[PDB]
Scaffold this motif. Structure first.
Motif, PDB file in Angstrom:
ATOM      1  N   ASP A 276       0.785  -1.222   0.000  1.00 45.93           N
ATOM      2  CA  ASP A 276       0.000   0.000   0.000  1.00 45.93           C
ATOM      3  C   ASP A 276       0.843   1.313   0.000  1.00 45.93           C
ATOM      4  O   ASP A 276       0.421   2.336  -0.515  1.00 45.93           O
ATOM      5  N   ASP A 277       2.033   1.216   0.567  1.00 50.49           N
ATOM      6  CA  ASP A 277       3.002   2.256   0.816  1.00 50.49           C
ATOM      7  C   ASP A 277       3.817   2.658  -0.460  1.00 50.49           C
ATOM      8  O   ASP A 277       4.515   3.684  -0.463  1.00 50.49           O
ATOM      9  N   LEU A 278       3.800   1.788  -1.482  1.00 47.40           N
ATOM     10  CA  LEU A 278       4.551   1.932  -2.725  1.00 47.40           C
ATOM     11  C   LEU A 278       3.689   2.195  -3.979  1.00 47.40           C
ATOM     12  O   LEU A 278       3.374   1.273  -4.705  1.00 47.40           O
ATOM     13  N   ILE A 279       3.343   3.466  -4.210  1.00 47.85           N
ATOM     14  CA  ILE A 279       2.598   3.949  -5.392  1.00 47.85           C
ATOM     15  C   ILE A 279       3.442   3.658  -6.671  1.00 47.85           C
ATOM     16  O   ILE A 279       4.635   3.929  -6.722  1.00 47.85           O
ATOM     17  N   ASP A 280       2.844   2.994  -7.637  1.00 48.23           N
ATOM     18  CA  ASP A 280       3.512   2.616  -8.881  1.00 48.23           C
ATOM     19  C   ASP A 280       2.489   2.674 -10.052  1.00 48.23           C
ATOM     20  O   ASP A 280       1.328   2.278  -9.871  1.00 48.23           O
ATOM     21  N   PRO A 281       2.916   3.142 -11.249  1.00 47.22           N
ATOM     22  CA  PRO A 281       1.993   3.294 -12.401  1.00 47.22           C
ATOM     23  C   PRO A 281       1.905   2.030 -13.305  1.00 47.22           C
ATOM     24  O   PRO A 281       1.505   2.139 -14.465  1.00 47.22           O
ATOM     25  N   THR A 282       2.295   0.859 -12.787  1.00 47.85           N
ATOM     26  CA  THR A 282       2.526  -0.384 -13.602  1.00 47.85           C
ATOM     27  C   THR A 282       3.786  -0.210 -14.483  1.00 47.85           C
ATOM     28  O   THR A 282       3.722   0.084 -15.690  1.00 47.85           O
ATOM     29  N   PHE A 306      14.783   1.407  -2.807  1.00 49.53           N
ATOM     30  CA  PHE A 306      13.860   1.153  -3.888  1.00 49.53           C
ATOM     31  C   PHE A 306      13.698   2.380  -4.811  1.00 49.53           C
ATOM     32  O   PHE A 306      13.483   3.508  -4.326  1.00 49.53           O
ATOM     33  N   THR A 307      13.813   2.169  -6.129  1.00 50.39           N
ATOM     34  CA  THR A 307      13.544   3.236  -7.098  1.00 50.39           C
ATOM     35  C   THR A 307      12.427   2.826  -8.046  1.00 50.39           C
ATOM     36  O   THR A 307      12.419   1.733  -8.579  1.00 50.39           O
ATOM     37  N   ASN A 308      11.531   3.781  -8.300  1.00 49.34           N
ATOM     38  CA  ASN A 308      10.435   3.618  -9.234  1.00 49.34           C
ATOM     39  C   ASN A 308       9.958   5.003  -9.573  1.00 49.34           C
ATOM     40  O   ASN A 308      10.567   5.986  -9.127  1.00 49.34           O
ATOM     41  N   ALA A 309       8.891   5.074 -10.363  1.00 48.94           N
ATOM     42  CA  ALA A 309       8.189   6.340 -10.648  1.00 48.94           C
ATOM     43  C   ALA A 309       7.066   6.409  -9.616  1.00 48.94           C
ATOM     44  O   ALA A 309       6.151   5.604  -9.699  1.00 48.94           O
ATOM     45  N   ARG A 310       7.153   7.297  -8.618  1.00 48.66           N
ATOM     46  CA  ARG A 310       6.175   7.243  -7.556  1.00 48.66           C
ATOM     47  C   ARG A 310       4.970   8.077  -8.024  1.00 48.66           C
ATOM     48  O   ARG A 310       4.880   9.283  -7.744  1.00 48.66           O
ATOM     49  N   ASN A 311       4.091   7.417  -8.784  1.00 47.53           N
ATOM     50  CA  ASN A 311       2.887   8.019  -9.344  1.00 47.53           C
ATOM     51  C   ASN A 311       1.890   6.883  -9.683  1.00 47.53           C
ATOM     52  O   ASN A 311       2.307   5.783 -10.058  1.00 47.53           O
ATOM     53  N   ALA A 312       0.599   7.148  -9.555  1.00 50.09           N
ATOM     54  CA  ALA A 312      -0.412   6.127  -9.729  1.00 50.09           C
ATOM     55  C   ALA A 312      -0.638   5.757 -11.199  1.00 50.09           C
ATOM     56  O   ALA A 312      -1.111   4.651 -11.517  1.00 50.09           O
ATOM     57  N   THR A 313      -0.261   6.637 -12.101  1.00 49.88           N
ATOM     58  CA  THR A 313      -0.688   6.468 -13.457  1.00 49.88           C
ATOM     59  C   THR A 313       0.321   6.775 -14.571  1.00 49.88           C
ATOM     60  O   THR A 313       0.189   6.299 -15.699  1.00 49.88           O
ATOM     61  N   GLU A 314       1.343   7.548 -14.250  1.00 48.16           N
ATOM     62  CA  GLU A 314       2.216   8.110 -15.250  1.00 48.16           C
ATOM     63  C   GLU A 314       3.619   7.729 -14.785  1.00 48.16           C
ATOM     64  O   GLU A 314       3.836   7.602 -13.587  1.00 48.16           O
ATOM     65  N   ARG A 315       4.564   7.578 -15.719  1.00 50.58           N
ATOM     66  CA  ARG A 315       5.936   7.192 -15.388  1.00 50.58           C
ATOM     67  C   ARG A 315       6.834   8.422 -15.143  1.00 50.58           C
ATOM     68  O   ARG A 315       7.820   8.644 -15.824  1.00 50.58           O
ATOM     69  N   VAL A 316       6.433   9.219 -14.158  1.00 50.46           N
ATOM     70  CA  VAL A 316       7.128  10.412 -13.805  1.00 50.46           C
ATOM     71  C   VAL A 316       7.588  10.345 -12.339  1.00 50.46           C
ATOM     72  O   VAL A 316       7.070   9.526 -11.530  1.00 50.46           O
ATOM     73  N   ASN A 317       8.536  11.226 -11.996  1.00 50.50           N
ATOM     74  CA  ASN A 317       9.013  11.390 -10.591  1.00 50.50           C
ATOM     75  C   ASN A 317       9.756  10.149 -10.052  1.00 50.50           C
ATOM     76  O   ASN A 317       9.263   9.445  -9.156  1.00 50.50           O
ATOM     77  N   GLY A 318      10.925   9.893 -10.634  1.00 54.68           N
ATOM     78  CA  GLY A 318      11.855   8.850 -10.148  1.00 54.68           C
ATOM     79  C   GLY A 318      12.199   9.099  -8.690  1.00 54.68           C
ATOM     80  O   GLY A 318      12.700  10.176  -8.318  1.00 54.68           O
ATOM     81  N   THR A 319      11.921   8.103  -7.858  1.00 49.97           N
ATOM     82  CA  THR A 319      11.823   8.301  -6.409  1.00 49.97           C
ATOM     83  C   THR A 319      12.654   7.238  -5.745  1.00 49.97           C
ATOM     84  O   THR A 319      12.590   6.090  -6.135  1.00 49.97           O
ATOM     85  N   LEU A 320      13.524   7.657  -4.818  1.00 52.81           N
ATOM     86  CA  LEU A 320      14.249   6.714  -3.988  1.00 52.81           C
ATOM     87  C   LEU A 320      13.421   6.476  -2.708  1.00 52.81           C
ATOM     88  O   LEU A 320      13.084   7.431  -1.975  1.00 52.81           O
ATOM     89  N   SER A 321      13.047   5.210  -2.462  1.00 56.70           N
ATOM     90  CA  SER A 321      12.309   4.869  -1.242  1.00 56.70           C
ATOM     91  C   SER A 321      13.201   4.071  -0.262  1.00 56.70           C
ATOM     92  O   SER A 321      14.041   3.257  -0.690  1.00 56.70           O
TER      93      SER A 321
END
Length: 380
Positions: A276-282, A306-321
């Motif tokens: 639930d804590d890790l928002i990802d756009p697929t 952890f690195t991903n695009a922290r967004n629900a829908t779009e592959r934006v905002n590369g985020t270190l978690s």
């Protein structure tokens, strides 16, 4: 010819004088349309046993097309932790035309016990992930094949083989790919020494995650039991006690990562749940131990990056978690790159800082010094 690689420990995060998380200079590893009609996608980043920093990605001719576009796996190398980069070398080159071959979606797996490096990727002929047929014959043009490239000289030279057959024990498995980014060598508990990477497959059950592993340091590969539904690109990380964690892209598009646990080195996985804590756009993503060498029971051993695009829908905002607790919770999310990032990956560099890659009009590289980590996950 280059010296044989010597065994050496994977790097651990080291402290820095940095007090907060700050991206270093941005380096443009490969720029789309340099040269004309060539596109670059799908990053993999590793630290070779001699400390060299290695970046792998697809060269895609004509457009950024997935397999079966006849792609090539290429690499660039840094000998000074990301500061400067050698020119591109070919891991495996595709060929165009009627009998096209494609090499696509790279991941590294470095074995510190031998110094050998693996580069997994697909080998495509006429068929992509979705349209690949059942069959494991090496020359089958309707099959998406699995290749591994092996280097014994820290990634200067590679030799190639098809591993499709030995990792297909369910004959209804009609397609597979190793998830791009990086796999791992296990360093702890009863499976220490085992090499492991995650696949996505389709079989008679559905679209599942599936571990492939080697207990002979990369001569032969075996597939564990598959898990979950609506699985996609997933990554495995070794937790503080040697329990394994899979972190997965969710082909059902919940807006979240998915997670599962293995108590037997990847042979079998348990239930797949949302994180639930890790928002990802697929989208692809990487999870890694910050201190791989650290022993069970220490505070260092439970820290995951952890690195991903922290967004629900779009592959934006590369985020270190950051997780201090074997991935049970994520206490910190910080975007290091606003706007388009696409697939991102990260790896600990030999100087102890973090190296990152993302996709923006090609492949981009930068460094995150890591001194600020102690203030998010204390070490004492």
């Amino acid at each position: 010819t280059w010296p044989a690689a010597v065994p050496a420990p994977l790097p651990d995060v080291r402290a820095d004088s940095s007090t907060r998380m700050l991206l270093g200079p941005v380096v443009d590893l490969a720029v789309n349309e340099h040269p004309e009609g060539v596109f670059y996608r799908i990053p993999a980043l590793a630290t070779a046993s001699n400390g060299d920093l290695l970046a792998s990605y697809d060269l895609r001719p004509g457009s950024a097309g997935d397999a079966p576009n006849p792609n090539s796996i290429v690499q660039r190398r840094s000998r000074d932790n990301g500061r400067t980069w050698g020119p591109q070398t070919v891991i495996h080159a595709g060929t165009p035309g009627r009998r096209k071959v494609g090499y696509s979606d790279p991941s590294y797996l470095v074995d510190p016990a031998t110094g050998r490096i693996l580069n997994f990727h697909v080998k495509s002929y006429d068929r992509g992930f979705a349209t690949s047929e059942v069959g494991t014959d090496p020359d089958d043009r309707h099959v998406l094949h699995a290749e591994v490239s092996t280097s014994t000289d820290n990634g200067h030279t590679w030799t190639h083989r098809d591993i499709t057959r030995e990792i297909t024990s369910d004959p209804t498995t009609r397609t597979r790919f190793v998830a791009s980014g990086q796999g791992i060598a296990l360093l702890h508990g009863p499976h220490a020494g085992r090499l492991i990477a995650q696949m996505t497959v389709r079989n008679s059950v559905g679209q599942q995650a599936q571990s492939i592993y080697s207990d002979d340091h990369g001569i032969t590969w075996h597939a564990g039991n598959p898990v979950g539904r609506m699985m996609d690109e997933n990554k495995v990380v070794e937790l503080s006690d040697g329990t394994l964690m899979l972190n997965s892209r969710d082909a059902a598009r919940s807006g979240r990562r998915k997670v599962a646990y293995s108590q037997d080195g990847g042979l079998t996985w348990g239930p797949v749940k949302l994180v639930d804590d890790l928002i990802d756009p697929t989208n692809n993503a990487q999870i890694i131990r910050a201190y791989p060498n650290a022993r069970a029971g220490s505070a260092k051993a439970r820290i995951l990056l952890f690195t991903n695009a922290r967004n629900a829908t779009e592959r934006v905002n590369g985020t270190l978690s950051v997780s201090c607790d074997d991935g049970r919770t994520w206490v910190s999310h910080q975007t290091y790159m606003p706007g388009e990032v696409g697939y991102t990956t990260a790896a600990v560099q030999s100087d102890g800082a973090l190296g990152v890659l993302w996709e923006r009009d090609g492949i981009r590289y930068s460094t995150i010094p890591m001194g600020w980590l102690n203030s998010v996950c204390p070490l004492a």
